UniProtKB/TrEMBL annotation, chain D:
<feature type="binding site">
    <location>
        <position position="42"/>
    </location>
    <ligand>
        <name>GTP 2</name>
    </ligand>
</feature>
<feature type="binding site">
    <location>
        <position position="43"/>
    </location>
    <ligand>
        <name>GTP 2</name>
    </ligand>
</feature>
<feature type="binding site">
    <location>
        <position position="133"/>
    </location>
    <ligand>
        <name>GTP 1</name>
    </ligand>
</feature>
<feature type="binding site">
    <location>
        <position position="82"/>
    </location>
    <ligand>
        <name>GTP 1</name>
    </ligand>
</feature>
<feature type="binding site">
    <location>
        <position position="42"/>
    </location>
    <ligand>
        <name>GTP 1</name>
    </ligand>
</feature>
Automatic annotation (TrEMBL), chain F:
<dbReference type="GO" id="GO:0003735">
    <property type="term" value="F:structural constituent of ribosome"/>
</dbReference>
<dbReference type="GO" id="GO:0006412">
    <property type="term" value="P:translation"/>
</dbReference>
<protein>
    <submittedName>
        <fullName>40S ribosomal protein s23-like protein</fullName>
    </submittedName>
</protein>
<keyword id="KW-0687">Ribonucleoprotein</keyword>
<comment type="similarity">
    <text>Belongs to the universal ribosomal protein uS12 family.</text>
</comment>
UniProtKB/TrEMBL annotation, chain G:
<dbReference type="InterPro" id="IPR013845">
    <property type="entry name" value="Ribosomal_eS4_central_region"/>
</dbReference>
<comment type="similarity">
    <text>Belongs to the eukaryotic ribosomal protein eS4 family.</text>
</comment>
<feature type="domain" description="RNA-binding S4">
    <location>
        <begin position="35"/>
        <end position="99"/>
    </location>
</feature>
<protein>
    <recommendedName>
        <fullName>40S ribosomal protein S4</fullName>
    </recommendedName>
</protein>
<dbReference type="Pfam" id="PF08071">
    <property type="entry name" value="RS4NT"/>
</dbReference>
Automatic annotation (TrEMBL), chain H:
<comment type="similarity">
    <text>Belongs to the SAS10 family.</text>
</comment>
<protein>
    <recommendedName>
        <fullName>Sas10 C-terminal domain-containing protein</fullName>
    </recommendedName>
</protein>
<feature type="region of interest" description="Disordered">
    <location>
        <begin position="11"/>
        <end position="41"/>
    </location>
</feature>
<feature type="domain" description="Sas10 C-terminal">
    <location>
        <begin position="1"/>
        <end position="74"/>
    </location>
</feature>
Amino acid sequence: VTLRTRKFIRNPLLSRKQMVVDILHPGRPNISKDELREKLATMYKAQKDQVSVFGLRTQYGGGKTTGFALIYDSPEALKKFEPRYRLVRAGL
Amino acid sequence: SLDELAYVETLFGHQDEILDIDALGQERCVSVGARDRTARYWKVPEESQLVFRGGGEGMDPASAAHEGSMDRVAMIDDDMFVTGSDNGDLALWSIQRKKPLHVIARAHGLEPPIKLEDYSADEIPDPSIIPAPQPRGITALRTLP
Amino acid sequence: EAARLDSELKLVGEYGLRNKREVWRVLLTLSKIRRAARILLTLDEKDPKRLFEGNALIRRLVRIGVLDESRMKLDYVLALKAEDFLERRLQTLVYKLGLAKSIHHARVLIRQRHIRVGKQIVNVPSFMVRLDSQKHIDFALTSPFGGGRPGRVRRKKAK
Amino acid sequence: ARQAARSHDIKEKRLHVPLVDRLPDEPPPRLVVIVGPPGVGKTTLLKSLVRRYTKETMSDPVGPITVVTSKKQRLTFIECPNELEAMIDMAKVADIVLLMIDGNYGFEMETMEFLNILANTGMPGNVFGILTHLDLFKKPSALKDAKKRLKHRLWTELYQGAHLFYLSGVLNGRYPDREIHNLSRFLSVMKNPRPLVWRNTHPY
Amino acid sequence: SATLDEFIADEVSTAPIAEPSIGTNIVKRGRGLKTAAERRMEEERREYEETNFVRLPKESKKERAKRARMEGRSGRMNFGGEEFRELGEGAERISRLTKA
Amino acid sequence: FGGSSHAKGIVLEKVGVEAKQPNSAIRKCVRVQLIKNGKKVTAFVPNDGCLNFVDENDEVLLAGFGRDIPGVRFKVVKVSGVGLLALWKEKKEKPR
Amino acid sequence: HQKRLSAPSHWLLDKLSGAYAPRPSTGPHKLRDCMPLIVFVRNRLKYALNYRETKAIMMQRLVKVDGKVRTDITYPAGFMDVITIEKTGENFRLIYDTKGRFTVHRITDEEAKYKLGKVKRVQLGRGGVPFLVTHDARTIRYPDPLIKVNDTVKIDLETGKITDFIKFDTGALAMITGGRNMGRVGVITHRERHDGGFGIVHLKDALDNTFATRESNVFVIGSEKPWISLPK
Amino acid sequence: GKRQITWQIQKNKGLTPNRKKEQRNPRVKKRKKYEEKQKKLRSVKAVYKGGEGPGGYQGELSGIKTNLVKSVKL
RNA sequence: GAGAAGGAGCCUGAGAAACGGCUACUACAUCCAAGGAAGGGCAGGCGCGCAAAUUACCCAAUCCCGACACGGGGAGGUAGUGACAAUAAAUACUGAUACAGGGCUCUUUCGGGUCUUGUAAUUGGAAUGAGUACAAUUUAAAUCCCUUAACGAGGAACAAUUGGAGGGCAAGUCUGGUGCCAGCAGCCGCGGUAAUUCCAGCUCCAAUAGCGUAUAUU
């Protein structure tokens, strides 16, 4: 259930904020990235509609999962800067 | 992690039961086990170890004892530390070298030799036979960061 | 070659392996090693190639703890054999470290993944061990010996 | 050397018995048996085949349906009903036999029965198998495993390295067109009937 | 020169080498124990993966065939934790460097 | 023989089914015709109730003999496209 | 459609960028004397991630190369071109290392406003007008008359006018932009004419290593006068 | 309302000769043959088998023949 | 390097003597209402009547072209088959009780050797992957992997084979011969198929996820 965000970059010119996001569910089942976007709306004080996470490789032996969360300054910035398949995976 | 009160990770590599561990404000460890005479500097979030083996090397020569076990550790700064072995050995070490920087034997001297009165139940107490004293060695260590 | 027959059988029986395939395979490993030993004797003493390559190979062998920390010379490098390679074979460590009553029970345990070395559980009983790791072998948390769930038979008997 | 050995092995397999041919210069329409279990859509295969060959949807195709597919030759497609008796009829007739197999169900007894009777009375020219109703599978691993095992069993029953095509769904209520197309591709590339003494001595 | 590199790495260099932990470098349920060089290669793969934090396709068929070909043609065997070269021209390089 | 390992043949006309004793080699001989030349040679079948499988004018494949009519050379492995030991372990029946 | 292995080695690229490398568009700089802008931003400076990412960032007017916005993705940025990005507000110059590979200097507008461009050729154009062609293929109408070949010129880059010049001088620190000893910072100490073609100079470093380099591939930077701040 | 096939025709063994557990696992068969051979060895030569009994010595618990020499004559 | 049915001539463009086109000649060859009219590629399957690797999917990444942020890309990468090899490895673990008394081995054999072994006995324990699988993830989308909740071994089953040696037989069959013999072997017997439950699943040996046989032969 616990999280860390190493290697965070502002990306001001792409208007996006990039953290190497490590999420750890010890003994819990897998993650539900949409719930992760909900949680990271709160974790970095945003809304769920301008955040998008991909990557999401759970390590060997369960628990830790490495993902890549992208926080845009606007959901429209996400719309203009986001990949098509990533948008429809988010549900837009 | 006490913040969520959970287990996060373990580390193995110790041939002995680990006797002592010291730490600092960074994400590292140092951990000594006894009969291997070995300190281990744990690089925690990358999960590596740095092995450090002691090999202990006007008095009777027999009383001088090598590094029997490896009892206490004190991490002083990010790069040096010290070990205390129960044969009275006090050894400053560097991360940068494989070798101890500086060890001193009989850090608390030798033990008092026992009486002939309790060593032998003889009406004649003879010092011709008597064991050599063992080195009064380290039970505990501390340092301030 | 009835001697070949009985010798291979005694190898398996003393260490309860499965077939002469696996036994011949470990013998092939030994053959490559003793080939190395022969070559490094063919170069004469105090030669630099000999010094560094032989020091290397001896460090390799003592790193996997097969050749003893006592004896550290090319003579004993020649003198090693299959019983020693089987000694550092893994399942033997479960039996000689007192978790499984029998070598076969150890084989079954390794199948259903109850022991680990360091972190990860192991399934292959021919995972060679290292001298530096061999004492760090215990049950995993998910196995009822180590804990976790009590098991399916305890589950059904409670049912 | 090894060239000579391999080549004489090749001619060795190139040998058979010397039987006489008796096929007229305008040979009759060679026959395709359609055969499967009950509830298999024997009917559906007939429908989709005749549409691919004739552009004409038959809402209820029965009987011997005869179709040209090359300037040399032509076929009569005919299914068996669900009786062993008509199965033995079309068995003693046949020259090429499509056998259709049910997927998630496994094998049907009449399927193996007919396989046996065709085996005894004679292996004709060509036999192919179509594994069908494949969209009754949630699990890709399950589907691929079933394909593997039924391939192996059908191989040792039929002969080594057989021909077993796959038919995924039922699209318009008709079939998948690409699958039935390359099916027609492999079956229209034709070979002479194989000389069974019955079909080279008598009239039928 | 690799044997020489290992000797100067451990024996004469008064600087201890970082060892990875025991259970981490087990590859697939025990079917692999990671050696130092390709373990470093794994580290290089992961550090590139976190540089641009992109995902990769796991090694494609051509590089797979290539490295398996090098293995099948290669005089090096990964017995346990260690690698084992054969004893031809690398050792002759040792001989040449020592004459130098 | 010849230049290849196996050879093909028709079986011509069985002798030795008039053979009196059950399992004598003069039951188990059979007369094959070598196709590559047209020869008439003499081959074995490894059991009586499988000689029963070899019927006249059914494709028959012969091969060597390695080990009471001493020195017959040939025995028969695949019958009509299926192996003899197969038929006689009753794996797959005979296609003619 | 060339390979990543056929890509030249002075602009760097790892083993994971796919087998192909983009070819640079034609322009002021030469083909093998180019690092494309995408290779700059996302492969060397990693500011974007994808082809379409870099594409979009350049479709919007956010970057200006040498004071002018550039939109084509593979524009030639060969040597000591200044690149401003106003969002971070940082400018970059493109030099070599001692190893002969591309290096990028972060810089502000104070040093970024000018360019030390190497003169290629002076001529007398139509209307008899003297003009100047520099290494950046920039022409200048009516230069100062003293500047002949093998001199460099400090250029305004906003009006683009002459701001200074350094004469070709055996006694001036120079930079190597070609050949087998490419990218070696040292002082011109001698020059041999070799009239008949391919004359050279003798150039020692700061630490007593003399070597013979061709006046074609030489490039002066200043007598001492580090007019562009080399990284320490 | 269909008709299944059986294990037989799914695995056309037919007229194979029948075998045992001991054969069917080639792990087990070299366990027992190793056991019985080691038992077979316990006929000819002499194995060590621990010390004298923990309760004590109890005679040569299976007889002594006098007139039997088991010495290799060198 | 040479070519886009064959020679000859011509046409655009920055770049072609594109093989892109036109024209003639030649040569096929299509439809036709007979007057006309268009047109010439690779891939595949057979190639004896008998045979063995997808007719998968996407431009997601990298790269390329255009009025051009979007469009298109036969590069590229994703997936499927596999005893041709090669790799790791299941098809079981372990008591307790009862009972039986031989089990086995051999130079040297009408003779010796060594001591706990077996039982198709009764029962107790645990252990579980293969299959099955909710999901979540992965991905262009899928799949695989990692995780992972839940089902999930008592033999007659979640059914290991190929190969050779040998033992035992009938109210059965046949070939010899100075009665009982001796051979060959023998799925056949009197009856009997919903009948029979027997060497009750015989013994040995080798390799066992494989292994034989012919031929050439070294």
